[model samples]
Target chain A: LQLPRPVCEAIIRPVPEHRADQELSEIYRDLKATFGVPWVGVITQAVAYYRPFFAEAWRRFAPSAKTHFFERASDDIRIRSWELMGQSFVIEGQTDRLREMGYSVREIGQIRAVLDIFDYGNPKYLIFATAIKEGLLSGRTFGGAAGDARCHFPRSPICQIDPIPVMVEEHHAGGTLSQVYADIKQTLQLPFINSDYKAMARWPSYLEQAWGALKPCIDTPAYQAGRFDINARALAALDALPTAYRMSRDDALQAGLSEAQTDELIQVISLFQWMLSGLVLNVTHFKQQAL
Target chain B: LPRPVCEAIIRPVPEHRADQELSEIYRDLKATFGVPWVGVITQAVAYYRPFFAEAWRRFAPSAKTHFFERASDDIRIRSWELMGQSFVIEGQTDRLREMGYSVREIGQIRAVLDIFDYGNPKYLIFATAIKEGLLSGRTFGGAAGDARCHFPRSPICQIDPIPVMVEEHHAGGTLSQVYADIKQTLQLPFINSDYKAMARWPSYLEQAWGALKPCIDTPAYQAGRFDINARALAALDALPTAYRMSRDDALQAGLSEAQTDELIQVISLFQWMLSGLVLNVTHFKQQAL
Candidate 1:
């Protein structure tokens, strides 16, 4: 079930769940439901778009994303990010500045509500990327110890919150905000701007202030430690979870992938897995500062 | 000729030398403008806090729009194309490969070069706006409501340390002399970050800088620089509103006589330098590939 070039091109573009064609879109929705997240994460969508292999990978890994073991593991990574990022990313006088800019209490509250979604979503996505990367690259000792106890109690659209907040879509952003998007991409070094930043960018002035503070800290020792800690915990957390998420190199070769493609796929996975760790901290920083 | 500001006392604070307050402001300027590094123009202006603060407040609202970014992008591509029309670098990538660097290392070096590639035009626009607004204080246009607010989400990947710059203190005799040569040839007080990042590959820097040196004073290079500047200024004029500030406005805003003169000199130096910066980075962009 090898996919040709056009299909490869389609998915490789990081199609969002809404934009995906029917079958692929449905999988994205299922992924959203299974993870209890409002949106399918960037890397997950990237994997889903990876063609025939996605069907095989998702079919096996979907249940793992739903488990209580997975829930606890994600919490561990999230908690570690918070521990490393204590008040370091908080920009003092931001509220005063926003107030000076004439944003009311209600508008400020709405901004906080937007950040809360990413704080919740970032860690879950990190775990999901880790599990998926483990599925593709690592073979030893997965699906171990803790039994398959599903924890599907926490579902999104909680309190009737919009499943996806109105983000400043790239095209909709003006020159000033557009450059902010460019800075975020270059500073963080990701394939696409994360959903969290777009959602936050809805309040243009605040995002300008927030990103200014965050960008400098990104290369700091504290951020490096936090990113390292989160990534290491995610791998360890995956170990404790009991689910069959392993995809050996041999399995990938059998699924019509060449050796080079396998390595490239692993690079993509590793790239996301590495990126998501820093993202969890960034989301946490915004949440802590805003709330 | 001695730089007026070198003897004038207060200098534009470069990013490395910034104190706590200026650092935050510097970061905001970079984030808002979407440029990777703050160009010398804004940093020079920012020394006059009250003047820059009010000036930026007026400049920022319009600068934040998509039309402005698109205009800058237009200038960037035009400048790059103009450079391509009159320059040739032969097989620089092959030369690097022969110099005993791996494909991966060259790619790593290219990644850093590209930060400037993504940013130089935006900085050019920023400088152009400042340059024009101070000289000609009139409305470029009206406010952008709902029209022209679209930009593509940018492409990205993870690269650590963003870029590691070779500071003046870190350069040895060969690199140090190259730095001085770059400063002199570019007529720049500070080495552009593009050159600093390239300095990490000393031999390649020597070769590339040597190639570009003779071309700096050529008719084609000046023509390209002047043409790019005109296009950039014209692009700034087409934006929703102009950044309206004048020399008199600076004096009235409470800047000292010496400070005002230095401010203008600093702004002019960087404004002129940014065009050359665009051409240089664009040339390197083609050669690196």
Candidate 2:
């Protein structure tokens, strides 16, 4: 796909050059000429000014797919959304400015709807909402009664999914716990051990729950039985035909195929397909969609 | 050294609170956008342009150092000199007036002097003599010839230290002759084998000549040997001793023993001995004279 022109232009534009070429020699000379009075301290200042841009480019080009995925999902999307909400909410909850700037109330309402649907269920999304709310509520205490009301219930046991209440807290706390465990093990000079108990126990339960949720639909039987392969093959064939036909048409045009020849070719193909489909449909009705 | 010494000396010091503002920007752009090529090309362009420009600017300060500027200067100087000479030689008064040199005083004869001198050879000596002759209304060419007539030509042959004539003629004449003579020797029906062979040989010969040519002394060697360290040391030694000299001279002009020793050490170690070893010792010594 073609990129937007402005994006391409920005990508091509050269940034300002720095004067670090003779910096080392300049520092040495300064040290000599100034007799170590720290005149060369300005080199550090110059480097400080330049280092961000250097580091920015360096970090951007670092080759790691996982880093890219995590950054895009978490920092770029979530953090940006969080920052936008925080700004809008702080200005007396006046979202008119946001709407005026092309972020419609409906867009935010859709986000709010998704957030609400996931809030009572999903561990990750609940924690995200909690953290955002806590940040927005800054300093106003949820007192004992209020805390109890909000925090009531140990998250539905029947849900089988991990509670969303601890998602953010666990991310931080779990990380610290793991690090602390590692530190202790390291201090005690423990041997490396491979443990699969958590993964082995958790995955089957997760998959069973997911499959159970999708089992009620009528298409599920055919999907589970893998009988939809023929339909898939037909779709693939249909997709390939467009490209094949276009290539042949281009070839015929380039070779100066006459209008009479093109019309005769089309008639022959239509007759052949009609006869073939008529023979096939007598036994299998493959030409008609299943009710 | 123990760990603390290594940490103090070798480890990079933590100078500021670590902030990842730029890193965050880069991470978001790279990861979120999936544009590694853009990232690479943009950063590479940004990094290189400034580096090259700064390097060129540092090395070449004047327009004379840049080819474009040097070409302009060559055209200006050549045109001006040619016009100045042609105006005088042609004696076109109207043309000269139009050319803006009408009010300028013109000399009848230009006497070029070839001086042969040793030690303090001054080409300006001829210019001074010419000025004196012009002031006295004595013809310059007559006076120069008469001066040469009085003295006997010295039997001692003066060598041209940098003989441009030999250099130009040897390469130019040989190449020209080779190009002219090679056709008959090769006798190729379709090809200009002579011209090609001449072209091939001239480039190779020129490269070989350049590689095998005599070395010359340069300004840096001259300064290190005779100018900077020697003059500095001489200035240091010229002061009178504390015992024989006046108190002010001893105190103000002369360095203390410790200071003088340090100065000598620096000159010996960093400047003179090092430069002498790198530059040819003979060339260094010759320039010291």
Candidate 3:
């Protein structure tokens, strides 16, 4: 019998598109199937670095899916994110044009789903990021452990799970993603390119077309300033949130993992905070890039 | 009930570059709002370029107006007061008061929570302003006012050390298990910050999660969420147009008029949803408190 350290510093780089162990592939399949996308996201890839933790967390986390309450709370935020997107929906001409350009109807639907996912994801990511902001402000880890042995588990989304297409960066044309990915990192002062880009990469041309519109806004003085302002706004929003009470770490340790895993968790959390605001600003400021 | 014409897009958003004009507007918005970036509303409006710019001119002038600042200040007061009154613990306030926490300490505790109370709704006002600027210039309920933003000091705390962990997640622990259960029940990916913030105090997290668990799946919780969204939307709709200027107002500033309503729609859409989410989160946070 073998028991392992759950996450074991599993992933720094992504698991390539071609590399697939049977078990890894199975999880990959479920992620696509369950989440309704064609490929895995950057978050999933990063989490997969620690395959055991991924296995263990999913093994325990998935079964609780139908019964859990995370989604309800998040949906409170998700609905709003979608509402903002509803304002941005393009008219028939845009879709008609895209079709004229060579995209099939189903492909366009998949593309919209990609937009919808990010639209839905931004606020939740902001929520997650706020937590990380606290950790960064404190200069501490965001690490947590497995649930306590005695506590019961529950399971979570904004709403519908669609079969949108996603792609790995490797699947993308080489220099393009690396450069864009680098752009995202440099502009936002973040090291990670969000999975949204990876998903867009599936339709390489479409991805590039839109990225071209958004690229100017990426890390310019204006873009950088906007990102800074957005982060501050998030911090304030979290501060305004009044909880029933506060708790200490020692109290929660009964069910959590060692401190090191917690640090990794903080990094994951930090990645999203940067990612979502990066996006909130990006999506909002995209029009400025129009030719 | 829906049509495909409104359903699809011509080109989905991809990472792209911008031109000089877009760059300037983006920068101006950041500087004006004290935000580093433009909002989704303005960005989409930018699709019409000069429209976004013109809207900014008309909408922004009034933002700095004394009359507008007064309205904004009124909202802050009322929202802050509304937040202070939302604590959930029955007698917890008095219980702490009885525990011998002094007046100063109580104020300190409330002040921390106040950060959220005022902090939460502050930005929603901006969204509202953008929309309000687009609408017919008129005031609405609480537009001239908001419910009191201050709550009477309750007796919930002591002057002694009060600390809570912020943003902790447990993989499979008791709290993690509870969060996992919550994730499924509510249909979200992770436990919210409110829960994690409380988790810093095990009993605090345990008790709140336990109380929340029962209603999560019930019609009551569902109703409560809807109810909050409705009321918030109503309140937003009632807000006086932030500026006397209208789509016509924006047109006067420079832009064409045909797309005025569409631009307003963009502003209003963001306005509706942002206020809706803020309201729901506020309602739930009130329940926790």
Candidate 4:
């Protein structure tokens, strides 16, 4: 069946376990079993909002997700991000600052996992998109012709995102902290706050101190170093995957969708990828600052 | 306190160019999208070739279908309307006069605030272009033209950069009270960036908030927010999407039907989320301004 152009079926809230339908509940069970998490992830939740998208994506991406290499990508991203981050951390003395700011070692370890998720999950999202785009063009016809674009189905590299440790919302955190949360969104135009800031809130004054150092430089070249460097390094590595694929917009038009569907599809990915890249760039900088 | 205790960056990129990574990616992007130079997003992603390169591999096929055009007068006009009504509150805006500032000075302050509100989105779209793929580089700056503008300064206002109090506690004794008030009015945890910057302007932070407190979140402000969201959602639908491509290229990419559905789903989430963001930011900035 032809998919409609993507829209927000996701509410401002998550669907609770008790609230989920039979199909969603089953998907949640599969998510937990497959990725080894306690609850459904926000990514899965977002997809579940439009249940078919999740239904179909899981069907396609799951086979490779259940493999060894997918986990390897996760481990690789987590390791390399640290490896690349080491020198910067050394320069910033991040661990010392967290210690100075009243953080325990155990607390820091927890936050470390938060960083690991974006480090791992973003590229996997890229792969998810890759496989999906390849499929779209290969089957459908548009522009009065058949889709003929091809893509290498790179091994699926998917994982469960760690549960967010703490979220910085305005009402509970009070006037000052909440606006900081909102301000970060404004400065970035990001759809949601990254988990890094949320987790950092568990410590006192650390989120604000680190943000002050980093905030002004946003949009400046310094910000881009943090923004561009990680993406450059990370994507460089991800591109090295055995899966090289190719397709153009024309293929989707010829194969299945109108130029409009193709455009919406492209815009969607671009927006998401852009948002994820911001996460990588941000968490990298904050980690360095904390060190 | 205004100067950062930490260095600007911890680990900077090396000056050496990574040209080889780009050659193939660039060739395909140009051939695929009909552009010559890679935009900021393409260059950044290619910096980490395999991840974004893989992403580009999947992303390229659908990208050409969307193009960035100028926001219609509708968006531009409403954007200004939202900003205009932000000030001019009956009980709220009256304080600027009593705060020993002339009406003209308040206008200048509003003008600078508008500049910031405008600049924030300009940068966002910059990222949008890189990942957005909606923008075609054929026209200058995707037809939005230059987003760069100087903060309008009146004769009374000095150009000294304002200290953005990162928090109320650090806002010193005087600024802290003002910071607290701003947060309470906006129901935000932190002070807005413009207010933080204003803290650098000596008494201006307190003065700005004094007048702003009356006007912010007033019935008018909330209505503006509602209007902006309606307009924003409408504007997005009208943006239009189109793509032209060689079908053979798609077939070669080689994803299954299920994979293709997954990709569309994945790519599509951002716009869904971003429309929320564009709407959210306008509202947040309105409160802060």
True contacts kept of each: 0.00, 0.00, 0.00, 0.00
Q: Name the runs in model 1 displaced over 4 angstroms.
A: A1-291, B1-10, B143-146, B149-162
Off by over 4 Å in 4: A1-22, A36-44, A83-91, A113-123, A129-173, A216-269, A289-291, B1-289
Clashes of each: 11, 2, 85, 69
| Top candidate by TM-score | 1
Candidate 3: misplaced stretches above 4 Å?
A: A1-100, A103-110, A136-158, A162-165, A169-192, A240-272, A285-291, B1-289
Error of 2 at B72 (Å): 48
**Model 1, TM vs. native:** 0.53
> Highest DockQ: which candidate?
3
- Per-prediction DockQ comes to 0.01, 0.00, 0.02, 0.01
- State each model's TM-score restricted to chain B: 0.87, 0.15, 0.43, 0.40
The pairs that clash in candidate 2 are A68-B31, A123-A164
Q: Model 1 chain A, poorest ten-residue lDDT window?
A: A2-11
What does candidate 4 score in Cα RMSD to the true structure?
30.5
Q: What's model 2's lDDT at B270?
A: 22
TM-score of each model, paired residue for residue: 0.53, 0.13, 0.36, 0.37
Cα lDDT of model 2 by residue, B81-198, tens digit: 3223322222233433354432331110000001010100011111122122222322222122222222211111122121111111234666654434432322211112112221
The stretch of ten residues in a row with the least summed lDDT in candidate 4 chain A is A142-151
